[PDB]
Structure formats: structure tokens, C-alpha cells
Amino acid sequence: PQITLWQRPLVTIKIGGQLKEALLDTGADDTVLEEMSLPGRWKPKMIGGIGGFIKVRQYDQILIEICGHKAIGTVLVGPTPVNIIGRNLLTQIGCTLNF
Amino acid sequence: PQITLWQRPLVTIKIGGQLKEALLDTGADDTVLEEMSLPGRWKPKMIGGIGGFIKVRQYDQILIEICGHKAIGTVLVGPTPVNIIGRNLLTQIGCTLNF
Ligand SMILES: COC(=O)N[C@H](C(=O)NN(Cc1ccc(-c2ccccn2)cc1)C[C@@](O)(Cc1ccccc1)C(=O)N[C@H]1c2ccccc2C[C@H]1O)C(C)(C)C
């Protein structure tokens, strides 16, 4: 589909058996979701945005579905104010910027 | 053009007769640039990101070129880690997300 940017590009994602709303963010290196439980091992990581850094848990090889498109990748979990889908997963669903 | 997301979508912009590198950020509502000088009076604004909020200076009706596409709009200036082109200007250049 073609998503305009008049409003924030929010979409529904399916992860860990849960349905969440997330922001398609081309300015995000990684994908970070609000506090939730995920299977497997994890490693701590510090990620920085405007305002500074926050500590998150890093889970690798996590299955996720965005707008019907299945993908696998690293998912960070921590105190983010909004669910963000970053470039690591946007590439997998074939998302591109056009103008 | 069509920009993939395997790497950061960094582009060249021109403002105040100077070239700068900026990030095309669909997750950003506004456009914020690193400390610089701009004409006219500015208004106060607080913008929130991953690690919190930062105070910025808001300048309106500023001429800015993005990838050669001329735009005229609001540009924020403050302690941002990187130059960010947000939806206010992405919409002016006709940028959309596609997959
Ligand atoms: C590489 O780091 C990242 O990719 N960081 C990502 C990141 O923060 N990305 N970017 C730009 C941005 C880009 C780089 C840096 C940064 C900071 C320190 C060192 C190196 N880079 C900071 C902000 C900004 C993000 O879109 C992320 C975001 C989205 C939604 C809610 C909160 C935060 C954002 O900050 N959006 C806000 C913004 C930006 C400019 C003007 C107004 C506004 C309002 C908001 O729209 C992250 C943490 C999701 C994975």
C-alpha cells in the first residue's frame, strides 16, 4: 500500500501473540516496543534519541507481522513512549520512501 | 526517487545557502536541525523523543531544499543529535511510504 504522511504512519503489528499499534519510522535504526514479554535470550542495550538514551532489552530473531507482511528480526523492549518499527524490519517488508 | 532503508535515509538539504546532511524521518512530526542561525523571530517549543524532551527554537516560513525539492515551512533549531526532516516537510515534497 501507499501510506501518506499527513498523519503519523501508524499500523497494526502482530507479535508474541499480541496485536499492537506501531509507528513506521524511517529515522529509527532499530525497532523498539513498549514493555512486554518475549521468548528467548536477551542482552541489554542503550539506544539514543532526541532527549537522550534509554535502556532496553534486545531480543534477536523475533517473528513479527506488519500489515500482513511476515518478517523476522531484532526487537528491543523498553520504556519507549511509542511503539516504533525501525529500518531493520521495514526493509524486510519491502518498505521504501518515494517522492 | 525511491529510497530503500538498508542504510539511513540521509539526504543533502540546503538552507541559508548552505548544504547539510539530514535524515528523512517519517517517525518525526517536525523538522529539527542542529544549532545554526536563521532569520526572523522564533517561538519556543518542546519536542519529545525516545529519551525525553528538548527545548528548541521554532522558525516559520523558512526556505529549505530537500534533495533539490524546494520547500518553505517550519524549521526547529536546537540540541538534536542529528538533523531530522519530519513529516511537515516530507509532505511538502510529496514523500510517501510504500510496500
Ligand atoms: C541511531 O539512533 C536511532 O536510530 N534512534 C531512534 C530514534 O530515536 N529516531 N529518531 C531520530 C533520531 C536519530 C538518531 C539519534 C541519535 C542520538 C544519539 C546518538 C546517535 N543518534 C536520535 C534521534 C527520532 C524519532 O522518530 C523516534 C520517536 C518516534 C515516536 C516517539 C518517540 C520517538 C523522533 O524523535 N520523533 C520525534 C521528533 C523528532 C523531530 C521533531 C519532532 C519530533 C516529535 C516526534 O515525532 C530509535 C531510538 C527509535 C532507535
> For residues B72 and B64, what is the distance between their CA atoms, to the nearest angstrom?
6
Can you tell me the distance from the alpha carbon of A59 to that of A82, in angstroms, rounded to the nearest whole number? 18
Give the other-Cβ count within 10 Å of A82's Cβ.
17
Q: State if residue A46 touches ligand 1 by the CB under 6 angstroms criterion.
A: no
Write the DSSP string, A22-57: EEE-TT-SS-EESS---SS-EEEEEEEETTEEEEEE
H or E element: which one contains B12? strand B10-15
- Residues A28 and B5: their CA atoms lie apart, in Å, by 10
Rounded distance, CA A48 to CA A79, Å?
12
Q: How was this structure determined?
A: X-ray
Q: What is the residue with the minimal CA distance to atom 41 of ligand 1?
A: B30
Please state the length of chain B: 99
Q: State how far the Cα of A23 lies from the Cα of A68, in Å rounded to an integer.
A: 15
Total residues found in chain A within this entry: 99
How many Cβ atoms from other residues are within 10 Å of residue A59's Cβ? 21
- Residue whose CA lies nearest to ligand 1 atom number 14: A49
Q: All 3 cell numbers of residue A37?
A: 514479554
B89–A contact, CB cutoff 8 A:
no
Rg (CA), chain B: 13
Nearest by CB to B49, from A4, A51, A87: name it: A51
Report the CATH number that the domain containing residue A74 is assigned in CATH.
2.40.70.10
- B82 to chain A: nearest residue by CA? A50
- Positive or negative torsion for Cα B79, A29, A74, A32: positive
Cell readout for A33 is 516496543
Nearest to B29 by CA among B13, B9, B49, B12: B49
Instruction: Collect all residues of chain B within an 8 Å Cβ-Cβ radius of residue A48.
Output: 50-51, 81
Strands (E), B1-99: 2-3, 10-15, 18-24, 32-33, 43-49, 52-66, 69-77, 84-85, 96-98
B84 grid coordinates: 531530522
Give B40-48 contacts, CB < 8 A, sequence gap 24+: B42/B77, B45/B76, B47/A50, B47/B76, B47/B78, B48/A50, B48/A51, B48/A81
Are residues B81 and A50 in contact, defined by beta-carbon separation less than 8 angstroms? yes
Cβ–Cβ < 8 Å for B86, B69 = no
| Closest residue of chain B to A79, computed from CA coordinates | B50
With contact defined as beta carbons under 8 Å apart, do A31 and A76 qualify? yes
Name the domain count of chain B.
Answer: 1
Which residue type sits at B76?
Answer: L
Cβ pair A96:B24 closer than 8 A: no
The residue of chain B with its CA nearest to that of A25 is B27
Asked if A32's CB is within 8 angstroms of B96's CB, the reply is no
Return the SS3 of B11.
Answer: strand
Sign of the dihedral defined by the CA atoms of residues B75, B64, B12, A82, in that order:
positive
Q: Name the region of B26 (left: φ>0; alpha: ψ -120 to 50; beta: rest).
A: alpha
**Partners of residue B53 on adjacent β-strands:** B48
Residue B25 to residue A26, Cβ atoms within 8 A: yes
Contacts of B17 (CB under 8 A, 6+ apart): none
Q: In which domain, by residue range, is B6 found? A: 1-99
Active site residue A25: yes
As given in the structure block, the three cell numbers for residue B91 are: 509532505
- Ligand 1 atom nearest to CA at B25: 26
How do beta strands A52-66 and A18-24 pair? Answer: unpaired
CB B83 within 8 A of CB B22: yes
